[PDB]
């Protein structure tokens, strides 16, 4: 086509989606990770995770307001990944890399899994 | 912080949100523009438009499944802008620039209004 493109549009959209998350505006699901609860937008979760994409395209699960993750999932690892989904920034540290990678594999977040594997390979 | 960032994340999120729109997945509102109807995600509309941000943060309007725009609004201008919201690409043409700018002013989409004003100034 003959379209023009606004370079910062996608980033500005995500920044606004994160502002809505911070103020709990139009969040439509609670993700339960053991004793912790995380409110989010189903569409954003689906856009970032192969697991959430599969869950919310399911004709029955699409209508659930609460999703319980596998008990092996670490709440901090999930929190770091939820922040990444809404910001593009990943808080990857020596103390959390194993939990973050395990959570990203479960959530089917391929690019996060890739950088975790590379950071781990560098320290061996 | 000591975060790393995935450059393409925001773009990939928006691409996935547009795929959901194309398959009518988790769309939660219909925007009526005269005889035309456009299905969309309230969160995406709010993230792109000052008008939709104000509408869906309203305690009563936040629960509406149908929003009727002002009858002066052109359905093609709205369609071009809805596509821009979900893709960052604006199909700006000599034949549609006036309708697109009028719609972007109504929707409170400042960057679109700015490029329309510049393209119009160049042709005078």
């Amino acid at each position: 086509d003959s379209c023009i493109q606004f370079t910062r549009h996608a980033s500005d959209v995500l920044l606004n989606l994160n502002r809505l998350r911070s103020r709990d505006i139009l969040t439509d699901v609670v993700i339960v990770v053991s004793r912790e609860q995380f409110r989010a937008h189903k569409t954003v979760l689906m856009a970032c995770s192969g697991l959430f994409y599969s869950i919310f395209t399911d004709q029955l699960k699409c209508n659930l307001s609460v999703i319980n993750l596998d008990p092996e999932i670490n709440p901090e690892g999930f929190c770091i990944l939820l922040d990444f989904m809404y910001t593009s920034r990943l808080n990857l540290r020596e103390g959390n890399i194993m939990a973050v990678m395990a959570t990203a594999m479960y959530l089917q977040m391929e690019h996060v899994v890739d950088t975790c594997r590379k950071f781990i390979k560098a320290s061996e | 912080d000591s975060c790393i960032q995935f450059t393409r994340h925001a773009s990939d999120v928006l691409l996935n949100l547009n795929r959901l729109r194309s398959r009518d997945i988790l769309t939660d509102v219909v925007i009526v523009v005269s005889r035309e109807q456009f299905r969309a995600h309230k969160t995406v509309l709010m993230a792109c438009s000052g008008l939709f941000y104000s509408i869906f943060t309203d305690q009563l309007k936040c629960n509406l499944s149908v929003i009727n725009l002002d009858p002066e609004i052109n359905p093609e201008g709205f369609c071009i802008l809805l596509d821009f919201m979900y893709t960052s690409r604006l199909n700006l043409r000599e034949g549609n620039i006036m309708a697109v700018m009028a719609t972007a002013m109504y929707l409170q989409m400042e960057h679109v209004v700015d490029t329309c004003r510049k393209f119009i100034k160049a042709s005078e």
């Binding site: 379209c3 023009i4 493109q5 606004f6 370079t7 | 690409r89 604006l90 960057h111 490029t115």
Partner: peptide, 4 residues
Amino acid sequence: WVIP
């Protein structure tokens, strides 16, 4: 704005 750019030419994509």
